[PDB]
């Protein structure tokens, strides 16, 4: 005779998860297969005492104590629902019992302080998370947003996920759990601009949140969505009275969302401990269901029950000492615990290895929605990092997005059609100045050319030419210069402007000063002006010299955000030096024009109109430029136009008539 | 004899909430007081069968069934913790038992589908939320924030709070879930700008999150913090290993945080069903505790046990039929249920009424931290809406902040000192023009003044005067005008400028053409210019007239957020018409200066020519400037006004000063 052995079991034949329909037949098949074998428990015989629980802890504790405070005496319990398993595991160390939940996937059952006798063949839900991070590091996403329904599972899953992301060079950006309304969740996902979402919720919360993401147009090539694989295929094509949207409005919202689930069946065909395979066990089972698989609940979680009872039989074989087990002996349970901890074998679900938490690790699966059809992608094992991709992820732009918009620092440059025009004009001006200088030099014998002070009109021409040349450097801002030779340009601007204007006005101003005092000493002042200019410029460049500075405008650009930067070479006390120099030159302009109005009565009376014109131009242009600093292509426009027009006018005024009369 | 009646109970003497230490003595006192009375249950006698539970659902179901599958037969259960109460209350309909919890504050127990036999003398935690809304609506806060520890309570409290805020003219603006360490919670409260926070967490979580709110400088006059008042007084002055901060860095971070907590004791002195009061019941109890109250556990939740057993005895007196109670009869339990829901009486804890969810309502007492001291504030009742202020809320800014930063619309105006100086200058210019006109009119016979066309110099002066007048409308942007007269100004600007510049430059240019003929025919062109100007201006005002347009710049200048506005008036095609007009007038300027350069040899000719050249260069360098500086006041107007005034001054002096200097 065989010493009978009993095991309590609680099978949910109804409720949120009806997984007893397909997991009672599996347990019975496994009992038959383990008792037919005469090498496992030949001295004993396993027997089952089933009770319904409805995945309800009220129906559950009643039957638990009906099967606990009654004979026969049990050696183990098998609760499937997370709630019943949680209650049973917590309230078993008080009876010295082992609990072997074949269908509970609550991370809270991985704790050994409350659940010191708990083992399960059903992987936890945290086991999606080793995958997600090992799916972010691939695509390198460090900024993440998470949303979670309020359930007894998803509350711990994101905790595990944060703990696992911290140690993965990744961080979270947004998280908000909705009890019943996901709208403000999506509203903040749109406000915070989270392009990567991790959606933990059941089918109904899904159909309720996707009819909100569509309403918020928060999908497409700039948004990714992770979910769970448990949702039945073709779940968005189902009535959703609370979802005001429609099939066509959702199928586009859930287009290309990733889905990490677990695999509860060895895709291999290699035999197992029971000399059976998956394709064979599925048939042997479906031959025992009064209903069909699609109508039989818990059909994907039957192999877990099979493997659980098989692991029980094994870990009970090593022990082999059981007919004398009472609810007060904390030693038989410890023997069975050390036998179950060391439980390694290949069952229908795969290789079962119970971690220290009691749970078992398994192979994660990954899918992606590709036109109303789920398309497997890859597998991942949190044990050996063995990631088996399949190159089937069809994104929108051939590659996946990233955390956030990239702020590219763009530089603003002149139109580059204005620069060419101003430069052509300045070159023509230099040509004209040289032509006039030559016509004057060659005119060293004529009277009108002899009377007109030529040694000062030549200086006027030289200064006008220098100023004209100052045009090209005024536009070099990166399109044609580098950060190394850039101070060269920012210094050439200053020196050319300074010296050119100094001479161009000193000649024509000493001429009027002489005309005044007189109605070869002119060279004295004609040189003293340039000397004061050189001295003040050197003092400026010694005290506060020019150096490159980048000015950043308001960041915006119509998936990158281009923040514009202007390359302005400016000193620290710049404005002060500019104001000082402009004030000195303005005093000088005003004195020159006053002396011109006073001394109106050779070739010195015409220079007065030129003086006044240059004066008004510079006076109206300097402050303009000082104000238009924040604008390129306009400040330079006025500066270059003022320079070139002053030059053209001065030259054609006080050099042209000479030839017009001498020609 | 008396037919004994038994009561199963589960008292937590250890765990997160050790509330059996002070609730077993209270139970026993209640049983003594309810059996010493011969007018409640004279045929019966209540007896207790207790078991410790440690607020542990493992140590709890063991004893539950040691007292369920054993004799004697129990008629009711009394669990204290919320885990234990959630475990029992769902495993009682299976035995047809009544569950009467004196210490469970979980909203999940206000459900009749899982817990149809459950009553509790301990109010739920949702009972804080009717207060909070009745404390937001007052201070007008439609945008709030939340964070929640991970517990079996706070998860449902914010659910109730959303359900109750939606239906009260309120809307949430943030939420999160501090599980292990609050770091992103506060960071997003700073980023999302949550100035109103509702933090539900246990003391450990508090001391852990406040050493982060400080580190983030997320407190002050612009932030308000709501909490629960269950934390013991002077709880921030305690060691905090993970909280690198200290009392000095926390006492300032928890300054002025509201702590709405329930009141478990009648502050009144009125007697109760037991002919006892609060100041007396507390003494009688403390005379039964081997430890000190502050050191004893569950000392504030004993009155609830007393009231619970009294309610049980009352609702069991009406029923009076109990010595034959089996676990399979679903009728005695229904009698006791209809007797318990109809239970109203004044006990130590107050008025003991049981809502449809089994729970009871009560009085929430508000508190606020004022210098390391909790300062009571008005109570509240979710039923009567009765709020009883004490007027002790000491805010920082003499008043409480609001949800966000009020965005004000700012109208930028001219310096208003520039305007005065420039107006003075334009007025002096008009005075000068009038003086010169009067002189030119008086000396109309002298050849020195008979040569210069006076019928045209008068027009030049009239135009200069009009242009000078155009300076005043150019600075009226609201500081001196309203939205009604503002188009009048945006029309006067146009007409004065146009007509004055016409009568000036057209007149001088026709005079130049006339003197060119040498190298009433002039009146013809001097009038045709102004006529074409009037025609084109009327076309513009009839097709695309000027209307006030506002320019909005980026918000800046920092709790008021200043939204800057620019009072402009430019038509839709304003740029097009302006460019057309400026191009035409520039062509005319160039033609005039060319005719002058050609007529430089052929009275008042060179003066007119120099004036033409100056006015031309000034207008040419000034118009596009003012067109680019549209987005800048005090600069565009500055250039425009200085140009107009200098053009007027010069065009007047150049050709009227020599006249008088020679005629003197
Ligand atoms: C009244 C006139 C006062 C000045 C008279 C003398 C002129 C120049 C001497 C001082 C020049 C300092 C320039 C330093 C660099 C700088 O900040 O340069 C300025 C730009 O240039 C100016 O502001 C100078 C304009 C001067 C125009 C004067 C009128 C024309 C006179 C021509 C006369 C010629 C014939 C004479 C007879 C700021 O660039 P930034 O940071 O945006 O970077 C480059 C951005 N593209
Ligand atoms: C080249 C020719 C240039 C001169 C054209 C003069 C004739 C007509 C100009 C018509 C301008 C219409 C302006 C409508 C209102 C408006 O928005 O006008 C604009 C633009 O103003 C201008 O552009 C005025 C330019 C006048 C100065 C240049 C010419 C001086 C000639 C002086 C001659 C005097 C006599 C000589 C003898 C500014 O306001 P807003 O949006 O910032 O708001 C109010 C802010 N406070
Ligand atoms: C497991 O099943 C396989 C196939 O059903 C068994 O392999 C057969 O064993 C029989 C012995 O009765 C042989 O006659 C056949 O030739 C085998 N077929 C093949 C394809 O190998 C195997 O023996 C079973 N394992 C056991 C019983 O331990
Ligand atoms: C309730 O208690 C009060 C006082 O605690 C009782 O009133 C006293 O009654 C006694 C009778 O034993 C008198 O001697 C005292 O003079 C009363 N004192 C006061 C202040 O009234 C009252 O009788 C009690 N009610 C009951 C027992 O029903
Ligand atoms: C893989 C997992 N197996 C079943 C859990 O193990 C039962 P649970 O109690 O842990 C969570 C639970 C789930 C549904 C309804 C109530 C509860 C699972 C999860 C969701 C679904 Cl839809 C399916 Cl088909 C399968
Ligand atoms: C008013 C309430 N009285 C006790 C609850 O009624 C027991 P609970 O189980 O419902 C929640 C619970 C509380 C603490 C530790 C574990 C659990 C209460 C709430 C918070 C605190 Cl910190 C305290 Cl001291 C007291
Ligand atoms: C073979 C094996 O892994 N045995 C484990 C042991 O390592 C671990 O210390 C113990 C803790 O429960 O569980 C058992
Ligand atoms: C405290 C209380 O309610 N006592 C009642 C009493 O009023 C009633 O007269 C009697 C008869 O039903 O039962 C008891
Ligand atoms: C059962 O235990 C026996 C030892 O008595 C053994 O040798 C056999 O391999 C066991 N069956 C297994 C491990 O499947
Ligand atoms: C009290 O309970 C009874 C049923 O026993 C029910 O009819 C009644 O509505 C309840 N009272 C309230 C206020 O819900
Ligand atoms: Mg799937
Ligand atoms: Mg308090």
UniProtKB/Swiss-Prot annotation, chain A:
One MF annotation (Gene Ontology) recorded for this entry: G protein-coupled neurotransmitter receptor activity involved in regulation of presynaptic membrane potential
Section covered of the full-length record: 166 to 861 of 961
Keywords noted in UniProt: Cell membrane, Cell projection, Coiled coil, Disease variant, Disulfide bond, G-protein coupled receptor, Glycoprotein, Intellectual disability, Membrane, Phosphoprotein, Postsynaptic cell membrane, Receptor, Repeat, Secreted, Signal, Sushi, Synapse, Transducer, Transmembrane, Transmembrane helix
Effect of residue 230 to A: Strongly reduces signaling via G-proteins. Strongly reduces antagonist binding
Protein residues bound to baclofen: 82, 105, 122, 202, 301
Tissue: Highly expressed in brain. Weakly expressed in heart, small intestine and uterus. Isoform 1A: Mainly expressed in granular cell and molecular layer. Isoform 1B: Mainly expressed in Purkinje cells. Isoform 1E: Predominantly expressed in peripheral tissues as kidney, lung, trachea, colon, small intestine, stomach, bone marrow, thymus and mammary gland.
Native species: Homo sapiens (Human)
Protein name: Gamma-aminobutyric acid type B receptor subunit 1
Known outcome of mutating residue 202 to A: Strongly reduces signaling via G-proteins. No effect on antagonist binding
Effect on the protein of changing residue 69 to A: Decreases signaling via G-proteins
Cytoplasmic compartment segments: 440-458, 598-606
Impact upon substituting residue 122 to A: Strongly reduces signaling via G-proteins. Abolishes antagonist binding
Principal cellular location given in the protein's record: membrane
Keyword S-adenosyl-L-methionine found: no
Residues spanning the membrane: 419-439, 459-479, 495-515, 523-543, 577-597, 607-627, 636-656
Function: Component of a heterodimeric G-protein coupled receptor for GABA, formed by GABBR1 and GABBR2. Within the heterodimeric GABA receptor, only GABBR1 seems to bind agonists, while GABBR2 mediates coupling to G proteins. Ligand binding causes a conformation change that triggers signaling via guanine nucleotide-binding proteins (G proteins) and modulates the activity of down-stream effectors, such as adenylate cyclase. Isoform 1E may regulate the formation of functional GABBR1/GABBR2 heterodimers by competing for GABBR2 binding. This could explain the observation that certain small molecule ligands exhibit differential affinity for central versus peripheral sites.
Membrane topology label: Multi-pass membrane protein
GO biological process: adenylate cyclase-inhibiting G protein-coupled receptor signaling pathway; gamma-aminobutyric acid signaling pathway; negative regulation of cell population proliferation; negative regulation of dopamine secretion; negative regulation of epinephrine secretion; negative regulation of gamma-aminobutyric acid secretion; negative regulation of synaptic transmission; neuron-glial cell signaling
Residues annotated to bind 4-aminobutanoate: 82, 105, 122, 202, 301
All ranges on the Extracellular side of the membrane: 1-418, 480-494, 544-576, 628-635
Protein family (similarity comment): Belongs to the G-protein coupled receptor 3 family. GABA-B receptor subfamily.
From Swiss-Prot, chain B:
Phenotypic consequence of residue 500 to D: In NEDLC; likely pathogenic; loss of function in G protein-coupled receptor signaling pathway; loss of surface expression of the receptor
Record annotation: effect of changing residue 69 to A: Decreases signaling via G-proteins
Consequence of changing residue 202 to A: Strongly reduces signaling via G-proteins. No effect on antagonist binding
Residues of the full protein shown: 166 to 861 of 961
Domain characteristics, as noted in the entry: Alpha-helical parts of the C-terminal intracellular region mediate heterodimeric interaction with GABBR2. The linker region between the transmembrane domain 3 (TM3) and the transmembrane domain 4 (TM4) probably plays a role in the specificity for G-protein coupling.
Family: Belongs to the G-protein coupled receptor 3 family. GABA-B receptor subfamily.
TM region positions: 419-439, 459-479, 495-515, 523-543, 577-597, 608-628, 637-657
Binding-site residues for phaclofen, renumbered to this chain: 82, 105, 122, 301
Assembly: Heterodimer of GABBR1 and GABBR2. Homodimers may form, but are inactive. Isoform 1E (without C-terminal intracellular domain) is unable to dimerize via a coiled-coil interaction with GABBR2. Interacts (via C-terminus) with ATF4 (via leucine zipper domain). Interacts with JAKMIP1.
Name of the molecule in the record: Gamma-aminobutyric acid type B receptor subunit 1
Record disease entry: Neurodevelopmental disorder with language delay and variable cognitive abnormalities: An autosomal dominant disorder characterized by language delay ranging from mild to severe, varying degrees of intellectual disability, and learning difficulties. Additional features include early motor delay, muscular hypotonia, behavioral abnormalities, sleep disorders, and seizures.
Chain sites annotated for binding 4-aminobutanoate: 82, 105, 122, 202, 301
Keywords, comma-separated and alphabetical: Cell membrane, Cell projection, Coiled coil, Disease variant, Disulfide bond, G-protein coupled receptor, Glycoprotein, Intellectual disability, Membrane, Phosphoprotein, Postsynaptic cell membrane, Receptor, Repeat, Secreted, Signal, Sushi, Synapse, Transducer, Transmembrane, Transmembrane helix
Tissue expression from the record: Highly expressed in brain. Weakly expressed in heart, small intestine and uterus. Isoform 1A: Mainly expressed in granular cell and molecular layer. Isoform 1B: Mainly expressed in Purkinje cells. Isoform 1E: Predominantly expressed in peripheral tissues as kidney, lung, trachea, colon, small intestine, stomach, bone marrow, thymus and mammary gland.
Glycosylation sites: 244, 275, 317, 329, 341
Topological domain ranges for the Extracellular compartment: 1-418, 480-494, 544-576, 629-636
Binding site for baclofen: 82, 105, 122, 202, 301
Outcome of mutating residue 17 to A: Abolishes signaling via G-proteins. Abolishes antagonist binding
Cytoplasmic side: 440-458, 598-607
Annotated phenotype, changing residue 362 to T: In NEDLC; likely pathogenic; results in decreased G protein-coupled GABA receptor activity; does not affect surface expression of the receptor
Compartmental location: Cell membrane; Postsynaptic cell membrane; Cell projection, Dendrite
